[PDB]
Design a protein around this ligand. Structure first.
Ligand SMILES: [Ca+2]
Ligand SMILES: [Ca+2]
Lengths: 177, 177
């Protein structure tokens, strides 16, 4: 099944990135809307454009203990953001089963997924083919390996975005399990 | 019993006030620390000083369904904030038992408590007695009536703060039940 996004909850551990730049909010990435700039109802989350010391990190609660099967993520749905801007290019999804320590340490977390947003055409930043746009509307898609433990809490870490920095912005994610 | 603050979670319903001014964050009002400006570890939440159209409102999840018995709230613990600044003066606590509608409507919520932060000395703003200080370390304190329903979700509405507007800032709250 698709996990029930009405149960998802923002968390904030020490050293996590704020995600509320450009009127963003973490709850906007589980509002069931895959949005673009100018849409109503909260477009997505956004850490900003300022330098960071390392990869952006944020944390949330699925509200259920689940055996995960699949994961998807969508960039904000316009040319400004497709394979561009602060959209994520290399990123990770991590999980754990018991309450996250508020100090934000990685110790208890397990890495579920190594994600790469691949641009089908491989065109330079700012050029898009019809296949690049199609892929962006499908979203990044992954199956979670069967050996992963059941998890309830999630972290996303942005290793690099499409502008070669550590910020991240996007519109929606979905979990199944 | 004191409700387990490790389980509390921020929510964000449409039209809720952002509470992240001055490096604030909602989770700082259930971190177990009753803090003043300059302290480490997140001082409190703060909606800013912009003029609002109405009472500031924000929402959170207790993480359990509880029969509530008591509520307490502390202002940021220094003379700048005691009966001053954006510290709450008249405010309300509201609750419900089932998932909050994300449209932020009041329809499903029930008002649990009418709170007033009373300044013992009644002195003008900026003047503090020893009694006024002692009361502010003890915090606002209320018993929740036995005829209230069990609730899992909470809203706080700031009708008026000590600067005669709708903003709110404070360092910690506690629920028992
Ligand atoms: Ca969304
Ligand atoms: Ca606190």
């Amino acid at each position: 099944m698709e996990l029930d996004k009405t149960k998802f909850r923002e968390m904030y551990l020490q050293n996590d990135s704020r995600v509320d730049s450009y009127d963003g909010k973490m709850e906007y990435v589980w509002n069931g809307r895959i949005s673009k700039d100018g849409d109503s109802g909260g477009v997505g989350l956004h850490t900003g454009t300022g330098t960071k010391d390392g990869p952006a990190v944020f944390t949330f609660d699925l509200g259920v203990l689940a055996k995960l099967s699949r994961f998807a993520l969508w960039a904000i749905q316009d040319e400004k953001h497709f394979y561009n801007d602060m959209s994520p290019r290399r990123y990770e999804v991590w999980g754990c089963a018991t309450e996250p320590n508020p100090d934000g340490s990685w110790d208890q977390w397990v890495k579920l997924l190594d994600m790469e947003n691949v641009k089908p055409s491989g065109s330079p930043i700012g050029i898009l083919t019809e296949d690049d746009i199609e892929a962006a509307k499908i979203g990044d898609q992954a199956n979670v390996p069967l050996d992963m433990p059941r998890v309830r809490y999630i972290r996303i870490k942005c290793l690099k975005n499409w502008s070669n920095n550590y910020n991240i912005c996007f519109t929606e994610l979905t979990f199944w399990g």
